């Protein structure tokens, strides 16, 4: 009782090529579903659509989420990370849960009274065989809060399974978490485990200083030839085939080694409202994929630059991670209440998401048939393509669990971060059934690896700076009410590398 | 663009010798290096390589919000800063302070 | 801003200067002091700041 089961650790040590970021928060776990595994479906909300159908179970267990970056990295550490380094990746994960406290609430007439419960336990288990469904990878809410002084609430755990409409099928699996061995903690006991990330490639934080089509030497002609003129001059029977040397004078027609990455086109919407037609096109005009009779919006999709150079206003409809500003409502908030992230860096090696991939020939030419081409709205992988993955943000997720299949291509998840077949295991928790709730201290510690910046660039880099101009309250800090706020999304790519 | 060191005039005393245009006041600065062409119309040419080893003091601070850092602008200028124009003329556009990171008083 | 300045020649007459052996010396750059009050940046101390020059800058006036 009177012996503390742990301490408070919250600092990042910078040692050589590795970073050690410890995060410790305080939590409050209520009792969900009154200790019941319950079925849920769309008919509870009515399921107005077929695309919205879901059939699943909701369990009393809660689960911890550190899966977003700003849990671990203070905005300063993140600056020191994005400025000086070309890449990073998690190595170790070390988790502790301690200083458990159990409080009972017995309502009597007006006031509710809250007293200790000494003999009560808190059941915790982590799935290290990954036999449960994995809900940590969808960018759900409920992660550890960014600011260390906050107190957060463990989100309820529930999962989904196969469905036709709201009905089940014979294959639908029902997992009872009580079937797993778990550990039980009283106020003096504490819980700890340690993890080791599987090998993942570095996340590359940098923006190329060369565009895929400018790789050439500007002073020297190629020895390849291209077809410059198909006619000498106006008239009948005037066709000719004339070849020229590929050189700086006509640069774009040179032969090249590699081609930009894939594209699946998105609609483009203008931050300026008056540049859009008066029609509802949010759902109807959105690029989406179809699975088993359901239409699923494509978000964000492949990594593609958001806009052509010079256009800040246009953004791909569903193709850009959008974050909320502090204190933004849930439903139909105006366009300046949310933060939009733009893929400016990927344009060099990646196509613009609102533009075509290119053109191809739609027929054979002849004297009777002109050359006819038509646009390419989507292009699968072709050998030789190079591309940049999607950027990760301070607010964005870290990892996902690769779906378990026979095959996949480039498992790196489309919302950013490190795709893994064995991510950090879920941590599930509940109160032991005897109104009761428990609190404690979560401490997560991750060890990161860093790829240092070797560049010989003579002129100074672009760095992430905090504007000096005076204002009513500092960025990334509390306000007079005490409400912590993150002004703008932060990308990881501020440095440069040769293509 | 400024100086590195300056020699402290050898005197009875001084107060805070650090020189006024900046840098490191020293009583035995790096020696002068004198050169001439031995008389025998004559001139000579060659290479000079100079190497100084600098020591650093790292930023340990616990400040939560981000620092003010020095950066390079991104607004499509005719020529990049700290680089050459079409005549091969290396131009330093603005002087750069050393003071960006923050400490407590 | 040229017009906030007095309409006279105060370049050497009005400047700060330490005197040595009957020979007046301008105080450049001077002791270490902030160049201006916060919020006003147009002004600068007369000799109190290292003044470099951009390339191509002439040697006079």
């Amino acid at each position, epitope marked *: 009782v009177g012996s503390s089961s742990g301490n408070w650790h919250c600092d990042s040590q910078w040692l050589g090529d590795r970073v050690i970021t410890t995060s410790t928060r305080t939590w409050a776990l209520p009792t969900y579903n009154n200790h019941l595994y319950k079925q849920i479906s769309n008919s509870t909300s009515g399921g107005s659509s077929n695309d919205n159908a879901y059939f699943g179970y909701s369990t009393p267990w809660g689960y911890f989420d550190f899966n977003r970056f700003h849990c671990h990295f203070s905005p300063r550490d993140w600056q020191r990370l994005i400025n000086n380094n070309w890449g990073f990746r998690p190595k170790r994960l070390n988790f502790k849960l301690f200083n458990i406290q159990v409080k009972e609430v017995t309502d009597n007439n007006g006031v509710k009274t809250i007293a200790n419960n000494l003999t009560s336990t808190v059941q915790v288990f982590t799935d290290s065989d990954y036999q449960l469904p994995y809900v940590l990878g969808s960018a759900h809410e409920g992660c550890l809060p960014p600011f260390p002084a906050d107190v957060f609430m463990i989100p309820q755990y529930g999962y989904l399974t196969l469905n036709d409409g709201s009905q089940a099928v014979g294959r639908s699996s029902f997992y009872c978490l009580e079937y797993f061995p778990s550990q039980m903690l009283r106020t003096g006991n504490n819980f700890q485990f340690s993890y080791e990330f599987e090998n993942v490639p570095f996340h590359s934080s940098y923006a190329h200083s060369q565009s895929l089509d400018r790789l050439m030497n500007p002073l020297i002609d190629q020895y390849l030839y291209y077809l410059s003129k198909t006619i000498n001059g106006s008239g009948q029977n005037q066709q000719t085939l004339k070849f020229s040397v590929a050189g700086p004078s006509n640069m774009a027609v040179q032969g090249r080694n590699y081609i930009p990455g894939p594209s699946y086109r998105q609609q483009r919407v203008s931050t300026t409202v008056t540049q859009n037609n008066n029609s509802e096109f949010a759902w109807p005009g959105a690029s989406s994929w179809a699975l088993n009779g359901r239409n699923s919006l494509m978000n964000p999709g492949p990594a593609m630059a958001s806009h052509k150079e010079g256009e800040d206003r246009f953004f791909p409809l569903s193709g850009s991670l959008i974050f909320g500003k502090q204190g933004t409502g849930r439903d139909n908030v105006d366009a300046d209440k949310v933060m939009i992230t733009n893929e400016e860096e990927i344009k060099t090696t990646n196509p613009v998401a609102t533009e075509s991939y290119g053109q191809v020939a739609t027929n054979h030419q002849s004297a009777q048939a002109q050359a006819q081409t038509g646009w390419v709205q989507n292009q699968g992988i072709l050998p030789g393509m190079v591309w940049q993955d999607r950027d990760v943000y301070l607010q964005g997720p870290i990892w996902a669990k690769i779906p378990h299949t026979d095959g996949n291509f480039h498992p790196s998840p489309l919302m950013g971060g490190f795709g893994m077949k064995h991510p950090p295991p879920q941590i599930l928790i509940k109160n032991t059934p005897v109104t009761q709730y428990s609190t404690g201290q979560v401490s997560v510690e991750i060890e990161w690896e860093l790829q240092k910046e070797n560049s010989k660039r003579w002129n100074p880099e672009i760095q992430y700076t905090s504007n000096y101009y005076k204002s009513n309250n500092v960025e990334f800090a509390v306000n007079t009410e005490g409400v912590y706020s993150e002004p703008r999304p932060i990308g990881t790519r501020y440095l440069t590398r040769n293509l | 663009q400024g100086p590195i060191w300056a020699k402290i005039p050898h005197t009875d005393g001084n107060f805070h010798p650090s020189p006024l245009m900046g840098g490191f006041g020293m009583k035995h600065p790096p020696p002068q290096i004198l050169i001439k062409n031995t008389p025998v119309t004559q001139y000579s040419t060659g290479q000079v390589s100079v190497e100084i080893e600098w020591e650093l003091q790292k930023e340990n601070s616990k400040r939560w919000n981000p620092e003010i850092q020095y950066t390079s602008n991104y607004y499509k200028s005719n020529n990049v800063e700290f680089a050459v124009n079409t005549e091969g003329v290396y131009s330093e556009p603005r002087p750069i302070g050393t003071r960006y990171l923050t400490r407590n008083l | 801003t040229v*017009t906030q300045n007095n309409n006279s020649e105060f370049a050497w007459p009005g400047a700060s200067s330490w005197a040595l052996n009957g020979r007046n010396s301008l105080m450049n750059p001077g002791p270490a002091m902030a160049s201006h009050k916060e919020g006003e940046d147009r002004f600068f101390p007369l000799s109190g700041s290292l003044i470099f020059g951009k390339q191509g800058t002439g040697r006079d006036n």
Partner: antibody
């Protein structure tokens, strides 16, 4: 050559803040060492100075305007923004951006001018 | 503030005929002036800076010499290309003030 473009809303509700921005192409505000300033032309009338902003961020405002105007200097994107508060029907005209300086006459005469920006304050 | 009054408010003078526009500062401006030219709807463009110094872009025809309380812009050999209002500006003391306008025909 210095080209100056203004952008922002062309209609603002009365007692709503007005915001324009001038993105200067052809120079670099941080290293040009010139003053940048605004003036306004109420229709069919003489232009009246609003204020200017020196490249280090210092700012002068016109006392006639009573502490409404605020000129922010965003040096990295190479543009500076005018913001005037509690707009009224009277405060509607074409707002010109200008480079306030030259070698001899810096922060005095306006040599290079914006294309102009119409703003109509209305209810 | 310092008032500025251009004496002709509307001067109708046709092609070839010499024109002179005069604007008097309320108080001595120590020969700091700036005549401008505004063709309808476009932004004005500078013509004469200080007292008599012509701008690089402007044609030799424009000229003017102020005595410091009195100023004149003489458009000599007026060509049809310019029929526009003309403003003057004080540089002497804040706030800078553009008096009225002189519309020429």
């Amino acid at each position: 050559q210095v080209q100056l473009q203004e952008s922002g809303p062309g209609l603002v509700k009365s007692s709503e803040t007005l915001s324009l921005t001038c993105t200067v192409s052809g120079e670099s505000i941080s290293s040009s060492s010139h003053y940048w300033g605004w003036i306004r032309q109420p229709p069919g009338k003489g232009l009246e100075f609003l204020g200017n902003v020196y490249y280090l961020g210092s700012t002068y405002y016109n006392p006639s305007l009573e502490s409404r105007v605020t000129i922010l200097l965003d040096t990295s994107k190479n543009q500076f923004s005018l913001k005037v508060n509690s707009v009224t029907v009277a405060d509607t005209a074409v707002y010109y951006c200008a480079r306030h300086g030259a070698g001899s006459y810096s922060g005095l005469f306006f040599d290079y001018w914006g294309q102009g920006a119409r703003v109509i304050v209305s209810s | 503030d310092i008032q500025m009054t251009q004496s002709p408010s509307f001067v109708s003078a046709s092609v070839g005929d010499r024109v002179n526009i005069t604007c008097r500062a309320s108080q001595g401006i120590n020969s700091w002036l700036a005549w401008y030219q505004q063709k309808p709807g476009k932004a004005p463009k500078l013509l004469i800076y200080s007292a008599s110094s012509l701008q690089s872009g402007v044609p030799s025809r424009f000229s003017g010499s102020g005595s410091g309380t009195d100023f004149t812009l003489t458009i000599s050999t007026l060509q049809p290309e310019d029929f526009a209002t003309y403003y003057c500006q004080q540089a002497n003391s804040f706030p800078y003030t553009f008096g009225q306008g002189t519309k020429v025909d």
